[PDB]
């Protein structure tokens, strides 16, 4: 929670930021498949869905990757304290 | 590092996952506006850009949010909890 203001002095200048995105497990529903699984936890950063790297991927594209395999969802996840 | 496989037993069954996204500062360029500002650090999650909350947003959404303000850029950033 820090307000930052960057002001350019030229139009061709850059801010100097390389921004990226991670998909993460925000919530797991009670009495759900995810709830009962041993290996997935709230806070987990999702590195792969069904064999595809999710780094920088939009949630819309993540949804299509999930819908592609009807019945099963494979992921590679990492503990938030490990990323 | 953790493999997850969730298998539905019924068609309308849900996985029980709420997946969200975080845009974060992967790298700051040397001697840049961002570097010289002091308040942004690598690892920071970008919570707000030019007055709009960024949660669930794609990098493409953030790019247009950033380009909305022509000469200047306002953000709210927040430390990565595990830094």
């Amino acid at each position: 929670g820090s307000k930052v203001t960057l002001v350019k002095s030229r139009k061709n200048e850059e801010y100097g930021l390389r921004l990226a995105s991670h998909i993460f497990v925000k919530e797991i529903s009670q009495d759900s498949l995810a709830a009962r699984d041993g290996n997935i936890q709230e806070g987990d950063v999702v590195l792969k869905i069904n064999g595809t790297v999710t780094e920088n991927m939009s949630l819309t594209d993540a949804k299509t990757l999930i819908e592609r395999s009807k019945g099963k969802l494979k992921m590679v996840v990492q503990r938030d304290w490990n990323s | 590092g953790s493999k997850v496989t969730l298998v539905k037993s019924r068609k309308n069954e849900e996985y029980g996952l709420r997946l969200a996204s975080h845009i974060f500062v992967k790298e700051i360029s040397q001697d840049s506006l961002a570097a010289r500002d002091g308040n942004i650090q690598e690892g920071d999650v970008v919570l707000k850009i030019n007055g709009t909350v960024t949660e669930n947003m794609s990098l493409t959404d953030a790019k247009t949010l950033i380009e909305r303000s022509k000469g200047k850029l306002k953000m709210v950033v927040q430390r990565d909890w595990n830094s």
């Binding site: 850059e14 801010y15 930021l17 390389r18 921004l19 990226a20 790297v53 780094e55 920088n56 991927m57 | 992967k26 990098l59 493409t60 953030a62 790019k63 950033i66 850029l73």
Partner: peptide
């Protein structure tokens, strides 16, 4: 990844 970082 196939999706590049955003540079600004």
């Amino acid at each position: 990844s196939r999706v590049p970082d955003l540079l600004v």
